Symmetry: D2
Subunit: 123 residues, 4 copies
């Protein structure tokens, strides 16, 4: 349903960029480039979305993960985004995210950042 | 590194079950069965993990997503887990998760549950 | 420092309103009126802020709680906001919040909404 | 209702300690001592709880805030806990928390830790 609507290049308020393909099966495959943090170039991302959303003008639930390792850097961390795609003239992906950094069991309590990202097709 | 350690069947305190394969590339593919909620049987999951973790006895950062649609039910929702694998005798995956339910823009404020799951290899 | 800057009436993107006094001691006392949810009229709020913030143009960390009970309604729930006050022409309070609803131990997993609120002095 | 049940000294899995008085009005006043982080000795805490909970064996929603400034240290940060008190033989407070550190607008994205604390009356 929102396969074509989701597929494409998205930008968030930090200037990060997210290229995604939605499969018909609910798959999400793409790359993420973060404008901030210990990151450089593209990182594989994988995820899922509801390929048959409510038809009552609800958004489409989706999420994806990025492990922050590629050929340039390893940040020993992983972010997941959870959110909804809302289509229409100004289509957007509204997300909250959890970023976990590898740590010892002692420092576990302080292992996880939380934030929110809004994605548009306009940078 | 933690490829074999991660790969396998995991259980959480709710009685949910998580079968995962770690690829050498940082991929995570598997199925999730939730003991609770609007869920029944298995749901595809995809994710990522750091395949080269710090060697200072840190955990391995990883995450994954489940869209709650399969052939039996569609819950119009998606969960992402963010966490670390910690190996050793009692290996565990400590996660926090975000669950987003498809909604209208008005009800967006109340679209996202947050929780924590601990996974062990013992049910 | 940000005592006068914090003290006053704030509005968020949902149309909710937040009247707060900052004490010199780091106290926050006021009332909250939510434009949404099972709420009506004002609810006591209490909180804390850092009364001696970094002087390097950082924000001022603060938080507060609202139990959603007053003389009109009891929602069996409580929200905490965690955030920073950033002063200047367009002063703002950027928050993430956790809303917990009283539940049985079984339904605990689904007891907590998470969101973000931005507060301005302009409605 | 849970005024006496809540009032007292609580301990969490990190070894932190939380002394709280519940007022009849839904107020929570006390001190927090964190076993970890940039903290030392006691920090004022203020909060709210539902003083008339559902009588269907639900928990009591409550929350509180600690600004991490006292006479020994200033951590430029604030934690809020959101959770429920569940009474009975092994009474517990199950919480999720948000910790915000004062930052510049650039580093805002990485300003907020998230975690969970379980409190018991047994250390």
């Amino acid at each position: 349903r929102d396969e074509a609507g989701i597929t494409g290049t998205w930008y968030n308020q930090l200037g990060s960029t997210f290229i995604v393909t939605a499969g018909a099966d609910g798959a999400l495959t793409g790359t993420y480039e973060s404008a901030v943090g210990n990151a450089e170039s593209r990182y594989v991302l994988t995820g899922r979305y509801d390929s048959a959303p409510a038809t009552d003008g609800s958004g489409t639930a989706l999420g994806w993960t990025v492990a922050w390792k590629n050929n340039y850097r390893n940040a020993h961390s992983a972010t997941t985004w959870s959110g909804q795609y809302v289509g229409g003239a100004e289509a957007r992906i509204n997300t909250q995210w959890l970023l976990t950094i590898g740590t010892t069991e002692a420092n576990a309590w302080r292992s996880t950042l939380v934030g929110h990202d809004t994605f548009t097709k306009v940078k």
